[PDB]
Protein backbone atom coordinates (compact mmCIF):
# COMPACT_ATOMS: atom_id res chain seq x y z
CA UNK A 1 0.00 0.00 0.00
CA UNK A 2 1.24 3.53 -0.78
CA UNK A 3 0.32 6.44 1.53
CA UNK A 4 -0.51 9.62 -0.38
CA UNK A 5 -1.29 13.00 1.21
CA UNK A 6 -2.78 15.50 -1.28
CA UNK A 7 -2.22 19.25 -0.79
CA UNK A 8 -4.01 22.10 -2.64
CA UNK A 9 -6.07 25.22 -1.89
CA UNK A 10 -9.73 25.35 -2.87
CA UNK A 11 -10.42 24.98 -6.61
CA UNK A 12 -6.78 24.20 -7.49
CA UNK A 13 -7.75 20.85 -9.00
CA UNK A 14 -6.67 18.98 -5.88
CA UNK A 15 -10.24 17.74 -5.45
CA UNK A 16 -10.29 16.43 -9.03
CA UNK A 17 -7.06 14.50 -8.56
CA UNK A 18 -8.54 12.94 -5.42
CA UNK A 19 -11.53 11.79 -7.42
CA UNK A 20 -9.50 10.74 -10.44
CA UNK A 21 -7.45 8.42 -8.18
CA UNK A 22 -10.43 7.04 -6.30
CA UNK A 23 -12.08 5.88 -9.50
CA UNK A 24 -9.20 4.70 -11.64
CA UNK A 25 -7.22 2.83 -8.98
CA UNK A 26 -7.69 0.53 -5.95
CA UNK A 27 -7.66 3.21 -3.25
CA UNK A 28 -9.02 3.80 0.20
CA UNK A 29 -9.70 7.35 1.38
CA UNK A 30 -9.31 8.97 4.77
CA UNK A 31 -10.45 12.50 5.55
CA UNK A 32 -8.63 14.16 8.46
CA UNK A 33 -11.80 16.28 8.93
CA UNK A 34 -13.99 13.14 8.90
CA UNK A 35 -14.34 12.80 12.69
CA UNK A 36 -14.92 16.58 12.96
CA UNK A 37 -18.00 16.26 10.78
CA UNK A 38 -19.00 13.14 12.65
CA UNK A 39 -18.66 14.86 16.02
CA UNK A 40 -20.71 17.86 14.91
CA UNK A 41 -23.47 15.77 13.33
CA UNK A 42 -23.74 13.89 16.62
CA UNK A 43 -23.59 17.10 18.69
CA UNK A 44 -26.25 18.75 16.54
CA UNK A 45 -28.68 15.86 16.79
CA UNK A 46 -28.25 16.15 20.56
CA UNK A 47 -28.78 19.93 20.62
CA UNK A 48 -31.53 20.31 18.04
CA UNK A 49 -32.88 17.18 19.68
CA UNK A 50 -36.31 18.25 20.86
CA UNK A 51 -36.14 21.73 19.35
CA UNK A 52 -37.50 23.43 16.25
CA UNK A 53 -34.02 23.91 14.82
CA UNK A 54 -33.35 22.54 11.35
CA UNK A 55 -32.39 18.87 11.26
CA UNK A 56 -28.80 18.76 9.96
CA UNK A 57 -27.43 15.27 9.28
CA UNK A 58 -23.96 13.97 8.41
CA UNK A 59 -24.83 14.49 4.77
CA UNK A 60 -25.38 18.20 5.43
CA UNK A 61 -22.07 18.42 7.30
CA UNK A 62 -20.62 16.67 4.25
CA UNK A 63 -22.05 19.60 2.25
CA UNK A 64 -23.99 17.20 0.09
CA UNK A 65 -26.50 19.51 -1.51
CA UNK A 66 -26.36 21.75 1.52
CA UNK A 67 -24.53 25.10 1.66
CA UNK A 68 -22.28 25.05 4.72
CA UNK A 69 -21.99 28.84 4.76
CA UNK A 70 -25.71 29.11 5.42
CA UNK A 71 -25.96 31.20 8.60
CA UNK A 72 -27.45 29.04 11.38
CA UNK A 73 -28.38 32.02 13.59
CA UNK A 74 -26.87 30.41 16.71
CA UNK A 75 -25.84 32.23 19.90
CA UNK A 76 -22.42 31.78 21.53
CA UNK A 77 -24.20 29.83 24.25
CA UNK A 78 -25.75 27.31 21.92
CA UNK A 79 -22.44 26.89 20.14
CA UNK A 80 -20.59 26.30 23.45
CA UNK A 81 -23.24 23.70 24.13
CA UNK A 82 -22.66 22.02 20.81
CA UNK A 83 -18.86 22.14 21.14
CA UNK A 84 -19.17 20.45 24.51
CA UNK A 85 -21.19 17.54 23.10
CA UNK A 86 -18.79 17.23 20.15
CA UNK A 87 -15.96 16.82 22.68
CA UNK A 88 -17.88 14.14 24.59
CA UNK A 89 -18.25 12.27 21.35
CA UNK A 90 -14.62 12.61 20.29
CA UNK A 91 -13.25 11.84 23.75
CA UNK A 92 -14.78 8.44 23.02
CA UNK A 93 -12.84 7.95 19.76
CA UNK A 94 -9.55 8.98 21.32
CA UNK A 95 -8.92 10.88 24.53
CA UNK A 96 -8.45 14.60 24.16
CA UNK A 97 -5.59 15.90 26.33
CA UNK A 98 -6.98 17.53 29.46
CA UNK A 99 -10.65 16.61 28.94
CA UNK A 100 -12.69 14.24 31.12
CA UNK A 101 -16.33 13.36 30.45
CA UNK A 102 -18.81 13.08 33.32
CA UNK A 103 -22.23 11.54 33.20
CA UNK A 104 -25.48 12.48 34.86
CA UNK A 105 -27.74 9.85 33.26
CA UNK A 106 -27.29 10.26 29.48
CA UNK A 107 -26.18 13.83 30.17
CA UNK A 108 -22.51 14.04 29.35
CA UNK A 109 -20.43 17.09 30.26
CA UNK A 110 -16.72 18.08 30.13
CA UNK A 111 -14.57 19.02 33.14
CA UNK A 112 -14.66 22.69 34.13
CA UNK A 113 -11.18 23.53 32.88
CA UNK A 114 -12.00 22.20 29.43
CA UNK A 115 -15.49 23.80 29.58
CA UNK A 116 -13.76 27.05 30.45
CA UNK A 117 -11.41 27.00 27.41
CA UNK A 118 -14.29 26.19 25.07
CA UNK A 119 -16.19 29.09 26.62
CA UNK A 120 -13.26 31.43 26.34
CA UNK A 121 -12.44 30.48 22.74
CA UNK A 122 -16.03 30.77 21.55
CA UNK A 123 -16.80 34.11 23.22
CA UNK A 124 -13.92 35.58 21.28
CA UNK A 125 -15.30 34.56 17.91
CA UNK A 126 -17.49 37.16 16.29
CA UNK A 127 -18.19 35.44 12.98
CA UNK A 128 -21.61 34.07 12.12
CA UNK A 129 -22.25 30.39 12.77
CA UNK A 130 -22.44 28.31 9.60
CA UNK A 131 -21.84 24.53 9.35
CA UNK A 132 -18.47 25.69 7.97
CA UNK A 133 -17.53 27.99 10.90
CA UNK A 134 -18.37 25.28 13.43
CA UNK A 135 -15.98 22.84 11.66
CA UNK A 136 -13.17 25.35 11.80
CA UNK A 137 -13.93 26.17 15.45
CA UNK A 138 -14.06 22.55 16.58
CA UNK A 139 -11.04 21.42 14.60
CA UNK A 140 -8.70 24.40 14.73
CA UNK A 141 -9.73 27.14 17.16
CA UNK A 142 -10.41 24.60 19.87
CA UNK A 143 -8.65 21.21 19.43
CA UNK A 144 -5.51 22.03 17.41
CA UNK A 145 -4.97 25.42 18.98
CA UNK A 146 -5.88 24.60 22.53
CA UNK A 147 -5.95 20.91 23.32
CA UNK A 148 -3.84 18.71 21.07
CA UNK A 149 -2.20 19.98 17.89
CA UNK A 150 -1.86 16.41 16.60
CA UNK A 151 -5.34 15.08 17.39
CA UNK A 152 -6.56 14.66 13.82
CA UNK A 153 -3.32 13.03 12.67
CA UNK A 154 -3.74 10.59 15.61
CA UNK A 155 -7.20 9.46 14.52
CA UNK A 156 -5.75 9.11 11.02
CA UNK A 157 -2.98 6.82 12.37
CA UNK A 158 -5.54 4.65 14.14
CA UNK A 159 -7.39 4.23 10.85
CA UNK A 160 -4.24 3.61 8.85
CA UNK A 161 -3.13 0.91 11.30
CA UNK A 162 -6.34 -1.00 10.74
CA UNK A 163 -5.91 -0.70 6.99
CA UNK A 164 -2.25 -0.82 5.92
CA UNK A 165 -2.24 -4.61 5.58
CA UNK A 166 -5.19 -4.75 3.20
CA UNK A 167 -5.32 -5.22 -0.52
CA UNK A 168 -5.56 -1.62 -1.65
CA UNK A 169 -2.89 -0.06 -3.84
CA UNK A 170 -3.30 3.42 -2.35
CA UNK A 171 -4.38 5.08 0.88
CA UNK A 172 -5.28 8.77 0.24
CA UNK A 173 -5.61 11.69 2.69
CA UNK A 174 -7.03 14.53 0.60
CA UNK A 175 -7.74 17.24 3.08
CA UNK A 176 -4.66 18.18 5.10
CA UNK A 177 -4.65 21.89 5.91
CA UNK A 178 -1.95 22.40 8.50
CA UNK A 179 1.78 22.25 7.95
CA UNK A 180 2.46 20.32 11.16
CA UNK A 181 0.11 17.64 9.84
CA UNK A 182 2.10 17.48 6.59
CA UNK A 183 5.20 17.15 8.76
CA UNK A 184 3.82 13.99 10.43
CA UNK A 185 2.67 12.57 7.09
CA UNK A 186 6.24 12.98 5.80
CA UNK A 187 7.85 11.42 8.87
CA UNK A 188 5.56 8.43 8.21
CA UNK A 189 6.74 7.86 4.66
CA UNK A 190 3.77 9.43 2.94
CA UNK A 191 4.24 10.71 -0.60
CA UNK A 192 2.91 14.33 -0.61
CA UNK A 193 1.42 15.53 -3.89
CA UNK A 194 0.69 19.27 -4.31
CA UNK A 195 -1.92 20.16 -6.98
CA UNK A 196 -1.19 23.73 -8.02
CA UNK A 197 -3.00 26.23 -10.22
CA UNK A 198 -0.40 28.78 -11.32
CA UNK A 199 -0.70 31.80 -9.04
CA UNK A 200 -3.97 31.02 -7.26
CA UNK A 201 -5.63 31.26 -3.85
CA UNK A 202 -8.62 30.15 -1.75
CA UNK A 203 -10.96 32.90 -0.45
CA UNK A 204 -10.81 31.72 3.20
CA UNK A 205 -8.73 33.55 5.77
CA UNK A 206 -8.61 30.44 7.98
CA UNK A 207 -5.15 28.79 8.15
CA UNK A 208 -7.04 25.72 7.00
CA UNK A 209 -7.82 27.69 3.83
CA UNK A 210 -4.25 28.69 2.96
CA UNK A 211 -1.52 26.98 0.91
CA UNK A 212 1.09 24.59 2.32
CA UNK A 213 4.80 24.66 1.58
CA UNK A 214 6.30 22.29 -0.93
CA UNK A 215 9.26 20.75 0.93
CA UNK A 216 11.80 18.63 -0.97
CA UNK A 217 10.59 15.18 -1.85
CA UNK A 218 7.18 16.78 -2.39
CA UNK A 219 5.87 16.08 -5.88
CA UNK A 220 3.79 18.82 -7.59
CA UNK A 221 1.14 18.59 -10.31
CA UNK A 222 0.88 22.06 -11.96
CA UNK A 223 -2.70 22.44 -13.13
CA UNK A 224 -2.09 24.90 -15.97
CA UNK A 225 -4.25 23.48 -18.76
CA UNK A 226 -7.04 21.17 -19.84
CA UNK A 227 -8.66 18.45 -17.71
CA UNK A 228 -7.26 15.68 -19.92
CA UNK A 229 -3.84 17.16 -19.32
CA UNK A 230 -4.50 17.02 -15.58
CA UNK A 231 -5.46 13.37 -15.86
CA UNK A 232 -2.27 12.57 -17.79
CA UNK A 233 -0.11 14.41 -15.26
CA UNK A 234 -1.76 12.35 -12.51
CA UNK A 235 -1.38 9.03 -14.38
CA UNK A 236 2.28 9.81 -15.01
CA UNK A 237 2.99 10.99 -11.45
CA UNK A 238 1.57 7.84 -10.00
CA UNK A 239 3.35 5.58 -12.48
CA UNK A 240 6.62 7.13 -11.30
CA UNK A 241 5.65 5.66 -7.91
CA UNK B 1 13.03 12.78 15.15
CA UNK B 2 14.15 9.46 13.65
CA UNK B 3 11.88 6.54 14.50
CA UNK B 4 13.88 3.40 15.27
CA UNK B 5 12.52 -0.09 15.95
CA UNK B 6 15.16 -2.43 17.38
CA UNK B 7 15.08 -6.16 16.74
CA UNK B 8 17.10 -8.92 18.37
CA UNK B 9 17.01 -12.10 20.38
CA UNK B 10 18.07 -12.52 24.00
CA UNK B 11 21.78 -11.85 24.43
CA UNK B 12 22.26 -10.57 20.82
CA UNK B 13 23.23 -7.22 22.29
CA UNK B 14 19.96 -5.55 21.28
CA UNK B 15 19.39 -4.20 24.79
CA UNK B 16 22.97 -2.96 25.00
CA UNK B 17 22.28 -1.14 21.75
CA UNK B 18 19.11 0.53 23.12
CA UNK B 19 21.07 1.63 26.19
CA UNK B 20 24.07 3.04 24.36
CA UNK B 21 21.76 5.20 22.24
CA UNK B 22 19.67 6.29 25.18
CA UNK B 23 22.92 7.24 26.91
CA UNK B 24 24.68 8.90 23.97
CA UNK B 25 22.07 10.74 21.90
CA UNK B 26 18.99 12.95 22.28
CA UNK B 27 16.53 10.06 22.38
CA UNK B 28 13.27 9.05 23.97
CA UNK B 29 12.28 5.38 24.51
CA UNK B 30 8.95 3.63 24.23
CA UNK B 31 8.13 0.03 25.11
CA UNK B 32 5.21 -1.64 23.34
CA UNK B 33 4.70 -3.59 26.56
CA UNK B 34 4.68 -0.49 28.77
CA UNK B 35 0.85 -0.25 28.90
CA UNK B 36 0.54 -3.99 29.49
CA UNK B 37 2.48 -3.72 32.76
CA UNK B 38 0.70 -0.45 33.67
CA UNK B 39 -2.73 -2.07 33.24
CA UNK B 40 -1.76 -5.26 35.10
CA UNK B 41 -0.32 -3.15 37.94
CA UNK B 42 -3.52 -1.11 37.98
CA UNK B 43 -5.81 -4.13 37.78
CA UNK B 44 -3.66 -5.80 40.42
CA UNK B 45 -3.82 -3.13 43.10
CA UNK B 46 -7.60 -3.18 42.67
CA UNK B 47 -7.82 -6.96 43.09
CA UNK B 48 -5.00 -7.81 45.55
CA UNK B 49 -6.58 -5.17 47.79
CA UNK B 50 -9.68 -7.26 48.52
CA UNK B 51 -7.51 -10.31 49.06
CA UNK B 52 -4.73 -11.48 51.33
CA UNK B 53 -2.39 -11.36 48.37
CA UNK B 54 1.13 -9.98 48.09
CA UNK B 55 1.60 -6.38 47.00
CA UNK B 56 2.64 -5.95 43.41
CA UNK B 57 3.60 -2.42 42.52
CA UNK B 58 4.38 -1.20 39.00
CA UNK B 59 8.05 -1.60 40.00
CA UNK B 60 7.78 -5.43 40.30
CA UNK B 61 5.73 -5.74 37.09
CA UNK B 62 8.84 -4.15 35.63
CA UNK B 63 10.76 -6.96 37.31
CA UNK B 64 12.63 -4.49 39.53
CA UNK B 65 14.08 -6.73 42.20
CA UNK B 66 11.29 -9.22 41.59
CA UNK B 67 11.08 -12.51 39.66
CA UNK B 68 8.19 -12.56 37.18
CA UNK B 69 8.44 -16.33 36.73
CA UNK B 70 7.10 -16.68 40.26
CA UNK B 71 3.73 -18.46 40.62
CA UNK B 72 1.04 -16.30 42.32
CA UNK B 73 -1.33 -19.21 42.83
CA UNK B 74 -4.28 -17.68 41.04
CA UNK B 75 -7.64 -19.22 40.20
CA UNK B 76 -8.79 -18.87 36.57
CA UNK B 77 -11.52 -16.87 38.30
CA UNK B 78 -9.17 -14.32 39.85
CA UNK B 79 -7.20 -14.02 36.62
CA UNK B 80 -10.44 -13.20 34.79
CA UNK B 81 -11.41 -10.44 37.24
CA UNK B 82 -7.85 -9.05 37.06
CA UNK B 83 -8.02 -9.05 33.28
CA UNK B 84 -11.40 -7.40 33.18
CA UNK B 85 -10.00 -4.55 35.30
CA UNK B 86 -6.95 -4.16 33.06
CA UNK B 87 -9.31 -3.92 30.09
CA UNK B 88 -11.08 -1.05 31.91
CA UNK B 89 -7.74 0.69 32.41
CA UNK B 90 -6.72 0.26 28.73
CA UNK B 91 -10.06 1.30 27.25
CA UNK B 92 -9.43 4.73 28.83
CA UNK B 93 -6.15 4.96 26.86
CA UNK B 94 -7.59 3.78 23.55
CA UNK B 95 -10.79 1.89 22.85
CA UNK B 96 -10.21 -1.83 22.42
CA UNK B 97 -12.40 -2.92 19.47
CA UNK B 98 -15.72 -4.21 20.74
CA UNK B 99 -15.32 -3.33 24.43
CA UNK B 100 -17.51 -1.01 26.48
CA UNK B 101 -16.81 -0.08 30.13
CA UNK B 102 -19.72 0.63 32.44
CA UNK B 103 -19.57 2.14 35.91
CA UNK B 104 -21.34 0.12 38.59
CA UNK B 105 -21.20 2.58 41.50
CA UNK B 106 -17.42 2.76 41.79
CA UNK B 107 -17.18 -0.46 39.79
CA UNK B 108 -16.29 -0.19 36.10
CA UNK B 109 -17.05 -3.43 34.24
CA UNK B 110 -16.79 -4.59 30.60
CA UNK B 111 -19.83 -5.41 28.42
CA UNK B 112 -20.84 -9.10 28.50
CA UNK B 113 -19.46 -10.37 25.20
CA UNK B 114 -16.04 -8.91 26.05
CA UNK B 115 -16.55 -10.36 29.51
CA UNK B 116 -17.46 -13.80 28.17
CA UNK B 117 -14.71 -13.64 25.54
CA UNK B 118 -12.26 -13.12 28.43
CA UNK B 119 -13.84 -16.02 30.32
CA UNK B 120 -13.41 -18.52 27.46
CA UNK B 121 -9.89 -17.31 26.71
CA UNK B 122 -8.77 -17.45 30.35
CA UNK B 123 -10.57 -20.77 30.81
CA UNK B 124 -8.28 -22.69 28.45
CA UNK B 125 -4.99 -21.43 29.89
CA UNK B 126 -3.68 -24.61 31.49
CA UNK B 127 -0.59 -22.82 32.80
CA UNK B 128 0.25 -21.49 36.25
CA UNK B 129 -0.20 -17.77 36.73
CA UNK B 130 2.94 -15.72 37.22
CA UNK B 131 3.46 -12.00 36.34
CA UNK B 132 5.11 -13.05 33.10
CA UNK B 133 2.05 -15.12 32.09
CA UNK B 134 -0.40 -12.42 33.00
CA UNK B 135 1.50 -10.21 30.54
CA UNK B 136 1.23 -12.68 27.66
CA UNK B 137 -2.35 -13.49 28.54
CA UNK B 138 -3.25 -9.80 28.54
CA UNK B 139 -1.05 -8.79 25.67
CA UNK B 140 -1.38 -11.75 23.34
CA UNK B 141 -3.89 -14.43 24.28
CA UNK B 142 -6.48 -11.76 24.82
CA UNK B 143 -5.86 -8.48 23.02
CA UNK B 144 -3.70 -9.38 20.02
CA UNK B 145 -5.29 -12.73 19.26
CA UNK B 146 -8.90 -11.92 20.13
CA UNK B 147 -9.59 -8.17 20.05
CA UNK B 148 -7.12 -6.10 18.02
CA UNK B 149 -3.92 -7.37 16.40
CA UNK B 150 -2.60 -3.82 16.27
CA UNK B 151 -3.64 -2.48 19.65
CA UNK B 152 -0.13 -2.21 21.12
CA UNK B 153 1.17 -0.45 18.02
CA UNK B 154 -1.83 1.92 18.20
CA UNK B 155 -0.80 3.00 21.69
CA UNK B 156 2.72 3.56 20.36
CA UNK B 157 1.37 5.63 17.44
CA UNK B 158 -0.41 7.90 19.96
CA UNK B 159 2.70 8.46 22.10
CA UNK B 160 4.95 8.89 19.06
CA UNK B 161 2.73 11.64 17.58
CA UNK B 162 2.63 13.34 20.96
CA UNK B 163 6.44 13.49 21.14
CA UNK B 164 6.63 14.54 17.56
CA UNK B 165 7.63 18.19 18.04
CA UNK B 166 9.70 17.52 21.19
CA UNK B 167 13.27 18.10 20.04
CA UNK B 168 14.45 14.51 20.65
CA UNK B 169 16.72 13.16 17.90
CA UNK B 170 15.54 9.56 18.10
CA UNK B 171 12.46 7.69 19.18
CA UNK B 172 13.43 4.11 20.05
CA UNK B 173 11.04 1.17 20.40
CA UNK B 174 13.13 -1.78 21.59
CA UNK B 175 10.70 -4.57 22.43
CA UNK B 176 8.77 -5.59 19.35
CA UNK B 177 8.43 -9.39 19.33
CA UNK B 178 5.78 -9.92 16.60
CA UNK B 179 6.33 -9.62 12.87
CA UNK B 180 2.93 -8.04 12.15
CA UNK B 181 3.99 -5.28 14.55
CA UNK B 182 7.22 -4.76 12.63
CA UNK B 183 5.15 -4.54 9.45
CA UNK B 184 3.07 -1.77 11.10
CA UNK B 185 6.32 -0.14 12.25
CA UNK B 186 7.61 -0.17 8.66
CA UNK B 187 4.25 1.25 7.41
CA UNK B 188 4.73 4.25 9.75
CA UNK B 189 8.24 5.00 8.42
CA UNK B 190 10.35 3.37 11.14
CA UNK B 191 13.89 2.19 10.33
CA UNK B 192 14.25 -1.44 11.50
CA UNK B 193 17.67 -2.29 12.95
CA UNK B 194 18.42 -5.94 13.83
CA UNK B 195 21.20 -6.76 16.29
CA UNK B 196 22.51 -10.23 15.46
CA UNK B 197 25.26 -12.51 16.81
CA UNK B 198 27.18 -14.84 14.46
CA UNK B 199 26.47 -18.55 14.77
CA UNK B 200 13.90 -17.97 16.00
CA UNK B 201 14.01 -14.19 15.67
CA UNK B 202 12.12 -11.74 13.46
CA UNK B 203 12.81 -11.87 9.73
CA UNK B 204 15.28 -9.44 8.14
CA UNK B 205 13.38 -7.82 5.27
CA UNK B 206 14.77 -5.66 2.47
CA UNK B 207 15.58 -2.19 3.75
CA UNK B 208 16.21 -3.39 7.31
CA UNK B 209 19.55 -2.53 8.87
CA UNK B 210 21.55 -5.35 10.49
CA UNK B 211 24.38 -4.78 13.01
CA UNK B 212 26.48 -7.92 13.47
CA UNK B 213 27.67 -8.11 17.05
CA UNK B 214 30.78 -10.14 16.32
CA UNK B 215 33.43 -8.27 18.32
CA UNK B 216 33.98 -6.32 21.51
CA UNK B 217 31.44 -4.04 23.21
CA UNK B 218 33.42 -1.12 21.87
CA UNK B 219 33.30 -2.55 18.36
CA UNK B 220 29.58 -2.86 18.83
CA UNK B 221 29.52 0.81 19.97
CA UNK B 222 31.35 1.93 16.88
CA UNK B 223 29.01 0.00 14.54
CA UNK B 224 26.05 1.74 16.22
CA UNK B 225 27.53 5.20 15.87
CA UNK B 226 28.19 4.72 12.14
CA UNK B 227 24.75 3.21 11.52
CA UNK B 228 22.97 6.14 13.09
CA UNK B 229 25.16 8.46 11.03
CA UNK B 230 23.63 7.09 7.81
CA UNK B 231 19.90 7.30 8.60
N1 LIG C 1 -7.65 18.90 7.59
C2 LIG C 1 -8.07 19.65 8.60
N3 LIG C 1 -9.22 20.30 8.54
C4 LIG C 1 -9.49 21.06 9.65
C5 LIG C 1 -8.63 21.11 10.75
N6 LIG C 1 -9.19 21.95 11.72
C7 LIG C 1 -10.31 22.36 11.22
N8 LIG C 1 -10.57 21.85 9.93
C9 LIG C 1 -11.81 22.24 9.22
C10 LIG C 1 -11.71 23.53 8.37
C11 LIG C 1 -12.25 23.16 7.03
O12 LIG C 1 -13.06 24.15 6.40
C13 LIG C 1 -12.95 21.83 7.21
C14 LIG C 1 -12.83 20.82 6.07
O15 LIG C 1 -14.09 20.22 5.74
P16 LIG C 1 -14.30 19.67 4.24
O17 LIG C 1 -14.52 20.78 3.30
O18 LIG C 1 -15.61 18.77 4.35
O19 LIG C 1 -13.13 18.80 3.91
O20 LIG C 1 -12.31 21.23 8.39
C21 LIG C 1 -7.39 20.41 10.78
O22 LIG C 1 -6.53 20.38 11.65
N23 LIG C 1 -7.15 19.70 9.63
N1 LIG D 1 6.46 -5.94 22.01
C2 LIG D 1 5.49 -6.69 22.52
N3 LIG D 1 5.66 -7.14 23.76
C4 LIG D 1 4.59 -7.90 24.14
C5 LIG D 1 3.46 -8.18 23.40
N6 LIG D 1 2.60 -8.99 24.14
C7 LIG D 1 3.23 -9.16 25.26
N8 LIG D 1 4.49 -8.52 25.35
C9 LIG D 1 5.37 -8.58 26.53
C10 LIG D 1 5.75 -10.01 27.07
C11 LIG D 1 7.16 -9.81 27.65
O12 LIG D 1 7.40 -10.53 28.82
C13 LIG D 1 7.29 -8.32 27.73
C14 LIG D 1 8.47 -7.53 28.08
O15 LIG D 1 8.46 -6.79 29.32
P16 LIG D 1 9.78 -6.39 30.12
O17 LIG D 1 10.45 -7.59 30.70
O18 LIG D 1 9.26 -5.47 31.30
O19 LIG D 1 10.71 -5.61 29.25
O20 LIG D 1 6.67 -7.95 26.40
C21 LIG D 1 3.29 -7.68 22.09
O22 LIG D 1 2.35 -7.85 21.31
N23 LIG D 1 4.40 -6.95 21.71
N1 LIG E 1 30.13 -7.28 21.21
C2 LIG E 1 30.23 -7.54 22.51
N3 LIG E 1 31.45 -7.74 23.05
C4 LIG E 1 31.59 -8.03 24.40
N5 LIG E 1 30.62 -8.13 25.29
C6 LIG E 1 29.42 -7.91 24.71
C7 LIG E 1 29.18 -7.63 23.38
N8 LIG E 1 27.90 -7.48 23.11
C9 LIG E 1 27.35 -7.66 24.25
N10 LIG E 1 28.16 -7.94 25.29
C11 LIG E 1 27.73 -8.46 26.57
O12 LIG E 1 26.53 -9.16 26.41
C13 LIG E 1 25.60 -8.78 27.43
C14 LIG E 1 24.19 -9.15 27.10
O15 LIG E 1 23.58 -8.56 25.97
P16 LIG E 1 22.13 -7.90 25.97
O17 LIG E 1 21.33 -8.27 27.16
O18 LIG E 1 21.54 -8.52 24.61
O19 LIG E 1 22.19 -6.42 25.87
C20 LIG E 1 25.99 -7.39 27.86
O21 LIG E 1 25.54 -6.94 29.12
C22 LIG E 1 27.46 -7.28 27.53
O23 LIG E 1 28.39 -7.20 28.59
MG1 LIG F 1 -22.73 13.30 24.78
MG1 LIG G 1 -10.99 -0.03 36.53
The CA-CA-CA angle for residues B94, B96, B97, to 5°, reads 130
Which atom of ligand 2 is the closest one to the Cα of B32?
A: 1
| Residues in the annotated binding site of A | 10-11, 13, 15-16, 36-37, 42, 68, 85, 108, 132, 139-140, 144, 152, 175, 177-178, 181, 208
8 A C-beta contact, residue B89 and residue B38: yes
**CATH 3.40.50.300 domain span(s) along chain B:** 1-32+155-230
* Residue ranges of chain B that CATH labels 1.10.238.70: 33-154
CA distance B31 to B159: 10
Asked if residue B163 lies in contact with residue B28, where contact means CB atoms within 8 angstroms, the answer is: yes
Q: Collapsing DSSP states into helix, strand and coil, what is residue A4?
A: strand
Instruction: Out of 1.20.5.510, 1.10.238.70, 1.10.10.10, 1.10.3720.10, select the CATH number for domain A33-154.
Output: 1.10.238.70
> Taking the domain B1-32+155-230, which CATH number applies?
3.40.50.300
- Reply yes or no on whether A15 is catalytic: yes
A103 Cα to chain B: minimum distance (Å): 10
Q: Where would I find the beta strands (DSSP E) of chain A?
A: 2-7, 27-29, 101-103, 108-110, 170-173, 191-196, 219-222
* Listed resolution, Å: 2.2
Find all residues with CB under 8 Å of A8, minimum gap 6, and list them. A14, A15, A17, A194, A195, A196, A211
Is CATH 3.40.1160.10 the right assignment for the domain spanning A1-32+155-241? no
CB-CB: which of A103, A164, A184 is closest to B184? Answer: A164
Dihedral sign computed on CA atoms, order B32, A173, A85, A46: negative
Q: With CB atoms and an 8 Å threshold, state whether B150 touches A160.
A: no
- Which uninterrupted H or E stretch holds A84? helix A76-91
Q: How many CB atoms are located within 10 Å of the residue A83 CB?
A: 24
Positions of CATH 3.40.50.300 in chain A: 1-32+155-241
Interface test with A, best of B157, B167, B170 (most A CBs within 10 A): B157
Give A-chain residues touching B183 at CB under 8 angstroms. Answer: 164-165
Q: Is B212's C-beta closer than 6 angstroms to any atom of ligand 3?
A: no
A167 burial (CB, 10 Å; 0-12 / 13-18 / 19+) is: exposed
B183 to A12, B5, B115, B178, B189: CA distances (angstroms): 35, 11, 30, 9, 10
> What is the DSSP-derived secondary structure letter of residue A75?
-
State the ligand closest to the CA atom of B150: 2
Residue A154: closest C-alpha in chain B: B158
Q: Determine the Cα angle at A99 with ends A98 and A100, to 5°.
A: 125
Method used to determine the 3D structure? X-ray
How far away is chain A from the Cα of B189, in angstroms, using its nearest Cα? 4
Amino acid sequence: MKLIFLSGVKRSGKDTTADFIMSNYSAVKYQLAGPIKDALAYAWGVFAANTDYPCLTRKEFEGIDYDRETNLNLTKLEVITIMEQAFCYLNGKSPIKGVFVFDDEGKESVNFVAFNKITDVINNIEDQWSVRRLMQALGTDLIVNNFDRMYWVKLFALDYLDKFNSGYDYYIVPDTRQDHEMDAARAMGATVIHVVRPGQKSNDTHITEAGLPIRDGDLVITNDGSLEELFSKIKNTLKVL
